[PDB]
């Protein structure tokens, strides 16, 4: 059938085959997660050290966009980098016209239209990535993940990459503990435990922990990475509980 | 692997002569018969209307007879829809020549142009050769009366006499017998109406299913005068032959 | 066959491989390069006495010190020749300096290896794919005489002797031992005639064989045909003496 | 009215010896009856033992000089590391200038 | 099957069969090894001839004063990319008074590639470049893949018989990183790395051509006497 | 058919008869019945409203859509296509003839324009022809009252009496025997209703039967008294009550 | 193609578009070119036995390019039309710009280049036409004769035949026309041209067109009486 | 064979792409009920339960396009989001030209034309959604228009979209035929909403809560979507009746 | 100033009853230099007569254009252009080039085929419909004829009383104007017969 041969064809299944294959690609790549705090947002990512040759903490997935939007991706790696770079262009134009760093629900909206356009056009193949992104803007804390359907939603917590079953199971607890989420500092420790628990499905090669946050309280309303001591204290806690 | 010759006539046929061109000859043959007789005394273009029944008001219909110029006219056979686009193209080019040189465009030149357009369709892209054949009646001042027919292929050839479309063969062989270089206008008109009757199953072949026209130099001062015979004047010609 | 995007599981493009097959079909062109000059010989080829051998040409000067021979698909080569001429005169304008034979080839390869059914970074005016070889020979001041083999698969290779066409297979082996650093001018002339004779059925005679040379002093010079005739005759004397 | 093309004075002097070449320029750069800068360089080495100075309007100077440096850089690059001679540089400059005669 | 004749349809695998085939030209390419210390970074590459009489053709292209690359895989695809790295360097310098960073280069190269496999037609790529350069943080080594995946390593090898070079880098990581401020001991190290990939071939000045860019050294391609000491 | 020369429509079909056009004909046919009768001092065109939910406001479906205020059109076939064609047709009508002669097109001229569009729309390898056939009814003083059929091939012809839709067989035969051009418009309005019953009777309220006439000038639809020279729209739209009244005057 | 890749280069390395173009030519009429030492004669088969046509008004296969250049062709007539005009444009362009008469050699390149360029362009094909381009260059007593083929290349020929029965017709030329003796007189040249044509045309004054070009821009069409004179003289020699 | 699949004409007379489009709509399992009130126009639709999606107050499905115009989607979210943007672009265009926002019928008509165009385009496929535009026009008053993938629109006294649309259609039908008025006579928008909730519950034969419904109300001069708690307040009054 | 004033020349049209007159001078001069005593200015496409003043190149290019457009019309419509239709077309076409305008003053004249009325109209540079039944006057001497004709004007004249009036008006006005002189031609169209009259004048 004409569904296998070409993208963006109504099939009785309701979705073209190409959308289904894409979904499988998304999973490939390590776990990335997001956690909405009572103040901010916490983004936390497993970075697999493949080899010793591979240099520590420099080949980082997380890229910073604007000063207040942290972006991270799992799936087809080249598709996602190419995507961040596209979204930058979207972001710059917004700031010329309107003289404001782009708000998050607005930012989501723009990106969404672009993916959708490729699932109506055969000539341009879709994206194959789930982008977890957000930060702290005027309209407060926000957290969106964007599916390659082209649909997006907000989320109190979200999960992508192979460890997603575990990460979701865990997240339910953070909600019992506090339905507005943990205070930014606390949240980071507990985030670190989630990463290690997702590392059992990614235990083939070792890893290095990386967490970043955008939070009003302690990050200054701007996105900066957890580094040094604050990182090390998280590193010790996760090790101690997985034992 | 494969995935070729499924969109474009750019890709050559296994055959070496386009397959697409052949399909075009077929269109023309579902259409009616048109008759050109070339004579120094004039040209006659007479054709059976494709259109049929009294339910359609055929008297009204003008769907095969077009003047390009006040000297040049066509009998058209093949697709009606494709023809319409082409009638308008002809008028624009012809009338631009008339502006540029303030001289009637010569018949041979006009036809040449339109043949280059037909050719363009196949040479470039996958556009179809237009499945229309025209008989041009024309008077150039040098060569007197000139009769051409053009193929959907993109070429034209002159003809002392021609038949096209349906029942090509039958018409031609009768036309060969009674053929004269000194053929009167009078005689040319009659000859066609007998030929038309033998190629159609209608023996009477109504006036309202007959299109007739005559390009005459019989008119005042040897001047070319185009005379489309109204259906009521066809009707009188029926009675003359006594086939009514 | 397959698209410009389409790559073989071997690794190499389909188009490129099919292109190599043509060169064998094209004319036998042999060069020997030496430091007093490069000598080029081609079978001009007769197939009928009606055909006028003399009128057609296979070696063409692109520059006043650079000549070219073509083997392969002669349809494609019309463009190639015209691009080349343009390139050489562009540099002669801009810089007023010797036409490096290296720089001329490099210009040639941008033009040749840029096929694509639609590109979005680059002007596509090609679809498929310039499957023609040229032996690009000359002198350029800095680095003396050069001879390159222009290749439709990729980067040109510098050669000291090269043999292409129908007679390549036999010639090329021969050229391994017989090419040496003691070939003077006089020798190089004789040798090309020798190989050409053995490997082609078409009898070596001047009406279907021709020689050419590049001496910096006189520029790229296509030889008169009387000259050519004398050389074929000396050759015969030495083959029949041994 | 935006004044089409300015001025900045100064004076240059090129003298061709017979084993050497000197090109000299003063360090005084002026606009009107101010000294913009008492000390400012304007004689620039573009590589391959060629020095250039384009004296008059400083904007027209600066922009030409850059496009000249680029031209030397990319000639070597494209010509597998081969010296740009003085005559080819002269010719080249001529064309840039003629291109900005309009 | 239809997914290696397209480039607009996701395979069931999840990534184009065409992108995987492309990789194979890389392995047919010349065996080239790349490695670094913080201070300097060295590429050692095999040049290949096509006949005995044929001279060797350089497999290291100089991009700029402070940069160059070594290529393994398709030549046509190469010409476009060599020009694009020059376009980037020339812009950064003229406009911003700043030479290009290797960090920046790789990322812009990812995006361009990816855009041309996504669109109908265009040019997918089939060449791997191991690009060295000297930036602010000293000499680095980046690996360019035609797939559009960039990683900074202290050592990799692409081409054929990559097993022997791979063992070499894996051993001598700890010994070579520590060795610093020595371009010479590190160049020597690369000739020894390549010795393992090769089988039944002379290691000679003609075969090997070595490039270096770092704090001390600008980009220089060493041939003849320049590599004779370290062999 | 569904040939390899029909995967793209730029190319000629092996039979010398385009693929696509035969597919268009099917669409028209499956369409609901409409019919047109040309009279000495009129044209009556008549159709049934497409059946929809009784919640749906089928008032909003106006089968009869004017091209210009004195010239109207009716269809059978695909409804979506029809609204789109109609938008194009309206634009070209004004642009080409009202900006250089200051007035509505003659019936003949406007008809010619629609017919051309449809050809162009099959030539391209993208565009497909509309799913409909039109009947175009209008009036002018230069060439009388007129009724045509335009086919989806892109060609037009005039018709004394014509019908499209699924009931076209039933209607044509009836028209022929019961009516001759000698009869007035007035007579025809009854006849047309009776032919529309033949197709399928049921409910015959003017809420589901749509009847328009093109005839005498409407002083009421001129909308202004003006110069005595101006004439109101020849076209007049009937209300459901009048339609209802001809059943009581049948 | 929606996603059909229409690209073509062939696994044998020579595109199919060029291959099929050669068949198209063969089907078309035969045309022959034979040059003396002082004239070029172009013999072409006209279809003229055919029912009721008027030959005058029917566009002649020889077509005047210039006042010293002619062109005749084999293949499809349609394909040939566009070329006539392009070639006509070029004849006055060359004169405009270089301000010299047309060179018979220069002009051939232009004709070649059209078909050729179209090998190496999407959406266009090599034309299915082989042609014979002949004339006498001004200020020279050299006769000039070429043959160009659909691929878009040329070669110069003492004598050559294109279109139908190319082997059979050329066989007569090999034995009875020579490079060693080309016909000295024009009249004799017409005579051997005519003799070849009888093989494939078998008489018919209208059916045979012979156009002689004599030095220095004198282009003349051979008289119907002279065509007939030649035929008769041949038929006598066959008795003997 | 090949053309059936793609969007170029089929032998059938009715493209299979339109059929396929309706099948896609029912996957989401989203009911609607829309009525004409006296001064209002009431739309209610099935709210997916928020897992953690967006704000749990409103998991958005009804989108305020402009003052008065609101739009409910039944069928795929990607196409939903696309549809909404195109509608907002169109409303600005019209506003600039004429000084007013689009009347509801015109806007339904604009969208029709664009879906149909999209099928003539070989490479492009049409919409997958069913869009019910609702508004209180100033000159046309209460208005409902449902525009389908086909390129076809029509007006409504009342309507239901979804898989169990028929059960709602029956219930409404008998009520409006008995009542002999095509609107809810109530002047107060509160009472119209209250009527609608009751009918919805009954028709599908299941109770509802606040997190199971999303309600948009269109009145003169504005469009507004009720609070999570506002839907609950109405619900309660019926409940203790 | 205007290029139309450099060549001068006039057209005048008057109404009768079911008959029209339209007349001009045959002088075309370019200032001093009289070039032609026979340059026509009134042209006809069938029964709709088109009189044209002003700039000389512009006259010829537009006559050819308006030839062009009514030739398209006659074949399409299959019927003779009307006086009325033609008027509307002329105006629209002068506004097409608003900038780089046309430097002419055309006069449309005719007898309606269906209504039988005598009709005349005038246009400005960039074209507008100017109705005024009695006369439309044009050219450099436009004022001379405005006053002259209105004093002499008597309504809906017979063919023969009309001939006298337009003759008298053209004759005195011309001699009182430098750029108008040499010969005259008058088209008296009775209803559809055209008698075509060269007038004698004392040529200087």
From Swiss-Prot, chain C:
* Domain of life of the native organism: Eukaryota
| Keyword vocabulary terms for this entry | Cytoplasm, Nucleus, Phosphoprotein, Proteasome
Tell where it localizes. Answer: Cytoplasm; Nucleus
Listed PROSITE patterns: PROTEASOME_ALPHA_1, PROTEASOME_ALPHA_2
A GO biological process of this protein is:
proteasomal ubiquitin-independent protein catabolic process
Q: Where are residues bearing Phosphothreonine located in the sequence?
A: 47
Q: Which residues carry this modification: Phosphoserine?
A: 48
Main localization is cytoplasm
A GO CC annotation recorded here is: proteasome core complex, alpha-subunit complex
Show the InterPro entries listed in the entry.
Ntn_hydrolases_N, Proteasome_alpha, Proteasome_alpha-type, Proteasome_alpha_type_5, Proteasome_asu_N, Proteasome_sua/b
Cross-referenced PANTHER family, in alphabetical order?
PROTEASOME SUBUNIT ALPHA/BETA (PTHR11599)
Its job = The proteasome degrades poly-ubiquitinated proteins in the cytoplasm and in the nucleus. It is essential for the regulated turnover of proteins and for the removal of misfolded proteins. The proteasome is a multicatalytic proteinase complex that is characterized by its ability to cleave peptides with Arg, Phe, Tyr, Leu, and Glu adjacent to the leaving group at neutral or slightly basic pH. It has an ATP-dependent proteolytic activity.
Q: Do you know which NCBIfam families this protein is assigned to?
A: PRK03996.1
Q: Indicate the family of this protein.
A: Belongs to the peptidase T1A family.
State any further remark: Present with 17100 molecules/cell in log phase SD medium.
Q: What is this protein called?
A: Proteasome subunit alpha type-5
Swiss-Prot record, chain E:
Q: Which residues carry this modification: Phosphoserine?
A: 11
Picking any one GO biological process from the record gives: proteasome-mediated ubiquitin-dependent protein catabolic process
Q: For the cross-link Glycyl lysine isopeptide (Lys-Gly) (interchain with G-Cter in ubiquitin), what are the residue positions?
A: 188
Q: Which Gene3D superfamilies does its entry note?
A: Glutamine Phosphoribosylpyrophosphate, subunit 1, domain 1
UniProt lists the family membership as follows: Belongs to the peptidase T1A family.
GO (cellular component) term, any one: proteasome complex
Keywords, in A-Z order: Cytoplasm, Isopeptide bond, Nucleus, Phosphoprotein, Proteasome, Ubl conjugation
| Compartments it resides in | Cytoplasm; Nucleus
- The gene that this protein is the product of is PRE5
Where does this protein come from, organism-wise? Saccharomyces cerevisiae (strain ATCC 204508 / S288c)
Q: Which InterPro entries match?
A: Ntn_hydrolases_N, Proteasome_alpha, Proteasome_alpha-type, Proteasome_asu_N, Proteasome_sua/b
Write down what this protein is called. Answer: Proteasome subunit alpha type-6
Q: What further note is attached to this protein's record?
A: Present with 7210 molecules/cell in log phase SD medium.
Function statement: The proteasome degrades poly-ubiquitinated proteins in the cytoplasm and in the nucleus. It is essential for the regulated turnover of proteins and for the removal of misfolded proteins. The proteasome is a multicatalytic proteinase complex that is characterized by its ability to cleave peptides with Arg, Phe, Tyr, Leu, and Glu adjacent to the leaving group at neutral or slightly basic pH. It has an ATP-dependent proteolytic activity.
Curated annotation (Swiss-Prot), chain F:
Top-rank taxon, per record: Eukaryota
Q: Which Pfam family is an annotated match for this chain, by its short name?
A: Proteasome
Listed SMART domains = Proteasome_A_N
Q: Where in the cell is it found?
A: Cytoplasm; Nucleus
Give the principal location in a single coarse category: cytoplasm
Task: Cite the Gene3D superfamilies for this sequence.
Answer: Glutamine Phosphoribosylpyrophosphate, subunit 1, domain 1
UniProt entry keywords in alphabetical sequence = Cytoplasm, Isopeptide bond, Nucleus, Proteasome, Ubl conjugation
What's an example GO BP annotation here?
proteasome-mediated ubiquitin-dependent protein catabolic process
Crosslink (Glycyl lysine isopeptide (Lys-Gly) (interchain with G-Cter in ubiquitin)) position: 108
Q: Name one GO cellular component term.
A: proteasome complex
The subunit field of the Swiss-Prot or TrEMBL record says: The 26S proteasome consists of a 20S proteasome core and two 19S regulatory subunits. The 20S proteasome core is composed of 28 subunits that are arranged in four stacked rings, resulting in a barrel-shaped structure. The two end rings are each formed by seven alpha subunits, and the two central rings are each formed by seven beta subunits. The catalytic chamber with the active sites is on the inside of the barrel.
Q: Which family does it belong to?
A: Belongs to the peptidase T1A family.
Anything else known: Present with 7060 molecules/cell in log phase SD medium.
Q: What is known about what this protein does? A: The proteasome degrades poly-ubiquitinated proteins in the cytoplasm and in the nucleus. It is essential for the regulated turnover of proteins and for the removal of misfolded proteins. The proteasome is a multicatalytic proteinase complex that is characterized by its ability to cleave peptides with Arg, Phe, Tyr, Leu, and Glu adjacent to the leaving group at neutral or slightly basic pH. It has an ATP-dependent proteolytic activity.
Q: What is this protein called in UniProt?
A: Proteasome subunit alpha type-2
From Swiss-Prot, chain I:
- Sorted alphabetically, which SUPFAM superfamilies does this protein's record hold? N-terminal nucleophile aminohydrolases (Ntn hydrolases)
Q: Which residues are modified to Phosphoserine?
A: 30
CC terms in the record's Gene Ontology section: cytosol; nucleus; proteasome complex; proteasome core complex, beta-subunit complex
One of the protein's GO biological processes? proteasome-mediated ubiquitin-dependent protein catabolic process
PROSITE patterns referenced in this protein's UniProt entry, alphabetically: PROTEASOME_BETA_1, PROTEASOME_BETA_2
Named from the GO MF annotations, one term is: endopeptidase activator activity
The subcellular location is: Cytoplasm; Nucleus
Keywords, sorted A to Z:
Cytoplasm, Isopeptide bond, Nucleus, Phosphoprotein, Proteasome, Ubl conjugation
- What is the location of the Glycyl lysine isopeptide (Lys-Gly) (interchain with G-Cter in ubiquitin) cross-link? 69
Binding partners and assembly: The 26S proteasome consists of a 20S proteasome core and two 19S regulatory subunits. The 20S proteasome core is composed of 28 subunits that are arranged in four stacked rings, resulting in a barrel-shaped structure. The two end rings are each formed by seven alpha subunits, and the two central rings are each formed by seven beta subunits. The catalytic chamber with the active sites is on the inside of the barrel.
Query: Which family does the record claim for this protein?
Result: Belongs to the peptidase T1B family.
Q: Which PANTHER family match?
A: METALLOPROTEASE TLDD, PROTEASOME SUBUNIT BETA TYPE-3
Descriptive protein name: Proteasome subunit beta type-3
Taxonomy of the source species: Eukaryota, Fungi, Dikarya, Ascomycota, Saccharomycotina
